[PDB]
Each structure stands twice: as structure tokens, then as C-alpha cells.
Amino acid sequence: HESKQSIMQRILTVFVFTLLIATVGLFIGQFVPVALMLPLSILEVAMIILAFWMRRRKAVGYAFVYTFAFVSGITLFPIVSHYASIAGAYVVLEAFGSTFVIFAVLGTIGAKMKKDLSFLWSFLLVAVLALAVVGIFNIFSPLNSAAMMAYSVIGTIVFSLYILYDLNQIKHRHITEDLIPVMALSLYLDFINLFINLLRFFGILSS
């Protein structure tokens, strides 16, 4: 019989594996010919939309989540390479570093705090959808640096709050073992979207 603790530990274990697998994917993605990379603006907003779409009470399996992590890692190279090119490759380390401690701190707080943050659910969904709208607008009417920097600040706040919220709800809600992959999937998309936002912000800032 599972405990709240074991279920949490299993979700976090899967989550860490998704990060490792995405990193392998990122490494492979460097070998994709430029003429076979999707446009930056399309990839950036695709991850936001995926963050929304994958947030369902539907039991996806480990195969989907791990494969998703592998392929999204491959497809995130053009984003990493773009911001590296305008600001140096060190900004990739900076962005990852910041994303890591933010997730680590907010996830720990969310999972340990007594307050139930469920009321945030509708606010957060609206916010991510708003980020999606702007990301789509950006495709057809490119935002300038100042606007894109402000876009990344909002996104940073939204996904940082989602990390606090997600770990909190994993503790507070009834999470069965079959929901383990989909929970880790949401954490992975929290991480990658926060990373994209911070990468973009710091990239543009030091460009």
C-alpha cells in the first residue's frame, strides 16, 4: 500500500528522469540541420500550449512521458542555440542554474506548506492561455526586445507559481499511482517553460 511520501518520491523520480532524457535529446538536437529546424517563435509557443494541453486528469503512461521528454529535448535545441548565439553559451548555464534552484525552492515550499493552493487553478489556467495568445501573436507580429523581455517576466512568474502549485496539489489532492506519469509530465513542462522564459529573458538582456 502506497503512502503520500512514496507517491511523491516516485513522481519526483520520474520527473528527474524526464530532465535527464530531455538533456540527451538536447544533445542530439545539435545535429539537426538548420533547414530542418522549426522557427524559434513556433517552438517557444508550442511548449506553452503543450503545458496547457497535457494538464488533464487523463492517465498517460511512462512510455509517452519519457518519449515526450526525449523529443521535446531534441526540439528545444534551436531555442537554446538562438539565445546562446546572441548572448554567449554561458547564458544557457545561467538559465538552467536559475530554473533549477527556483524549482527546487518553490517545489519544496509547495510540497511542505500547510495551505491548500487549489483555489489558484482557474487563475493559472487563464494565465497560461494568455501566454499562449501572446506567443501566437508573436508569430505573426513579432514583439520587440522590450516587449519580449516583459513577456518572459510574466511567464517566469506564471510557471514559478505553477511549480509551487503543482507540488502543493500533489500533496493535498488524491493522487494514485496510475497518475504518476501525468503528474511528472506537468512538472517537466513547468521546468522547461520556466527555463525557456529565463533563457529568453537573460539572453535578450545580455544581447
Swiss-Prot record:
Organism annotation: Bacillus subtilis (strain 168)
Activity regulation note: The calcium-release activity is mediated by two factors: pH and transmembrane ion gradient. It was proposed, based on an MD simulation, that the conserved aspartyl dyad (Asp-171-Asp-195) regulates Ca(2+) binding, pH sensing, and the channel pore opening and closing, and that protonation of Asp-166 probably weakens its interaction with Arg-55, facilitating the opening of the channel. Another study using nanodiscs suggests that Asp-166 is not a pH sensor regulating the pore dynamics; instead, it is only involved in the gating of calcium ions.
Cellular component terms per the entry's GO annotation? membrane; plasma membrane
- What family is this protein classified in? Belongs to the BI1 family.
Q: What stretches pass through the bilayer?
A: 11-32, 40-54, 62-81, 91-112, 118-141, 147-170, 181-202
- Catalytic reactions on record: Ca(2+)(in) = Ca(2+)(out)
Q: What is the effect of changing residue 44 to Q?
A: Causes a large disruption to the gating mechanism and thus allows a large amount of Ca(2+) influx in a ER-like lipid environment
GO BP annotations, alphabetical order:
calcium ion transport; regulation of proteolysis
Summary of the function given for this chain in its UniProt record: Calcium channel that probably plays a role in the regulation of calcium homeostasis. Uptakes calcium ions and mediates calcium flux in proteoliposomes in a pH-dependent manner. When expressed in E.coli in the presence of high extracellular calcium concentrations, shows calcium-leak activity, increasing intracellular calcium concentration. It can also mediate Ca(2+) flux from the endoplamic reticulum (ER) when expressed in permeabilized mammalian cells. Calcium transport activity is also detected in ER-like lipid vesicles.
Top-level taxonomic group: Bacteria
Q: Which residues lie on this side of the membrane: Extracellular?
A: 33-39, 82-90, 142-146, 203-207
Ranges in the topological domain labelled Cytoplasmic? 1-10, 55-61, 113-117, 171-180
Report if keyword Cell membrane is assigned.
yes
Stated membrane topology is:
Multi-pass membrane protein
One GO molecular function term of this record is: calcium channel activity
Q: Where is this site: Important for activity?
A: 166
Free-text note on domains in this protein's UniProt record: BsYetJ in nanodiscs is structurally different from those crystallized in detergents. In lipid nanodiscs, BsYetJ conformation is pH-sensitive in apo state (lacking calcium), whereas in a calcium-containing solution it is locked in an intermediate state, inert to pH changes. When crystallized in detergents it shows a pH-sensitive conformational equilibrium between a rather flexible pore-open state seen at lower pH and a pore-closed state seen at higher pH. BsYetJ appears to be a lipid-sensitive membrane protein: differences in membrane lipid composition lead to changes in functional sites.
What is this protein identified as? pH-sensitive calcium channel
What does the subunit section of this Swiss-Prot or TrEMBL entry state?
Monomer.
Sorted keywords for this record are: Calcium, Calcium transport, Cell membrane, Ion transport, Membrane, Transmembrane, Transmembrane helix, Transport
Q: Where in the cell is it found?
A: Cell membrane
Alphabetical list of InterPro entries matching this protein? Bax_inhibitor_1-related
